[PDB]
Amino acid sequence: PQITLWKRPIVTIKIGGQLKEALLNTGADDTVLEEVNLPGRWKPKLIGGIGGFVKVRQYDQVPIEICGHKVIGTVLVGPTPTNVIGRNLMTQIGCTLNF
Amino acid sequence: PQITLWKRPIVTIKIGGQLKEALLNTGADDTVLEEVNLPGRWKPKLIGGIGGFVKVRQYDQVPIEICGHKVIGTVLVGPTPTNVIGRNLMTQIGCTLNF
């Protein structure tokens, strides 16, 4: 699909057997979700945005289906005003900017 | 051009006669820069991101050339960790996400 930018580029994902929506975010290196629950071990991490830093759990090799495309990568779980898919997953689906 | 997401989608801009780099950010509604000197009147605004919220100046109708494409629109000036081109300007240059 081609997605224009007149509205926020939001897509439906499935992760951990649950359905969420999330913003395709070229401004984000990493993928950050809240209130998903992933199984197993994680590592504590801190991520930074516009107004400061937050603590997140880092999970590796998490299966995520992103607008009907199956991918595996790192998923960070923590406080965020909104769910974000970052470049680490976007490259996996072959997502580009075009102008 | 087409820009893949294996690294940060950073472009060169000219704004108010100064040259800057900025990150093409589908996750930002608005365009936020630091250390730019815009002329004239402006209104205080607060923007939010991950980590919390930042006080900014809002300037309307600011010419800005973004990868050699001339557009006009709202530019926010305030403490950001990186300069961001938002969707408000990206739609003006015809920028889309493709996968």
Binding site: N25, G27, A28, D29, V32, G49 | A28, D29, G49
Partner: peptide, 6 residues
């Protein structure tokens, strides 16, 4: 409004 690194 304006979305991350480190």
């Amino acid at each position: 409004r304006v979305x991350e690194a480190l």
